C-alpha cells in the first residue's frame, strides 16, 4: 500500500515562484491532482494530469502562472508555482487514483467530478506582500 507525500510549502513574496513535490504513486496510468485549501473555505482543483496521455487540465486562475510536471520514472509529481499572489496562499493537497468512472474522463480535461481514493495531508503556503 502507499501514502502519497507532499513537499515545497512556505511563506513567499509575491511576485515569487515556488516547487511543490509530490511522491508515492505507483501508478503507470492513473489520475494525480492537486488541491488548494484556502482556510475556512471550499476545496478548490489547481491541477490535473492522466499520466496515460500526459493530458493536462489547469484551473483558469492559475493558468499560465502553474505549471505541473513528472519526474522520469513518474515516481513524483511537480507543480511550480510561478509569479505567486497574495490569494493563492493556502494550504496545498496532492491526491491520486479515481474512484468514480466520471472522475476518470474528467482528469486532464474538466474540472469534472474529481474524486480520489488516496490523499496526502499537503503543505501551507503563505503569500509574504
Ligand atoms: C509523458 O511524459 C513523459 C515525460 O514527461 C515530460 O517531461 C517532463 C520533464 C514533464 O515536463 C512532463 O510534464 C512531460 O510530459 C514521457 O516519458 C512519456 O513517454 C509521456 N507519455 C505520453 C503518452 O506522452
Known amino acids: 500500500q502507499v501514502q502519497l507525500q507532499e513537499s515545497g510549502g512556505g511563506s513567499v513574496q509575491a511576485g515569487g515562484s515556488l516547487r511543490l513535490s509530490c511522491s508515492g504513486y505507483?501508478?503507470?496510468?492513473?489520475?494525480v491532482v492537486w488541491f488548494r485549501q484556502t482556510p475556512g473555505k471550499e476545496r478548490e482543483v489547481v491541477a490535473s494530469?492522466?499520466?496515460?496521455?500526459?493530458?493536462?487540465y489547469y484551473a483558469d486562475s492559475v493558468k499560465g502562472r502553474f505549471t505541473i510536471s513528472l519526474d522520469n520514472g513518474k515516481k513524483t509529481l511537480y507543480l511550480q508555482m510561478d509569479s505567486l499572489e497574495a490569494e493563492d496562499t493556502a494550504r496545498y493537497y496532492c491526491?491520486?487514483?479515481?474512484?468514480?468512472?466520471?472522475?476518470?474522463?474528467?482528469?486532464?480535461?474538466?474540472?469534472?467530478?474529481?474524486?480520489?481514493?488516496?490523499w496526502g495531508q499537503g503543505t501551507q503556503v503563505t503569500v509574504s506582500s
Open positions: 494530469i492522466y499520466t496515460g496521455d500526459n493530458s493536462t
Open positions: 505507483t501508478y503507470s496510468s492513473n489520475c
Open positions: 491526491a491520486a487514483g479515481a474512484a468514480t468512472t466520471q472522475t476518470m474522463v474528467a482528469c486532464g480535461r474538466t474540472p469534472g467530478p474529481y474524486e480520489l481514493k488516496y
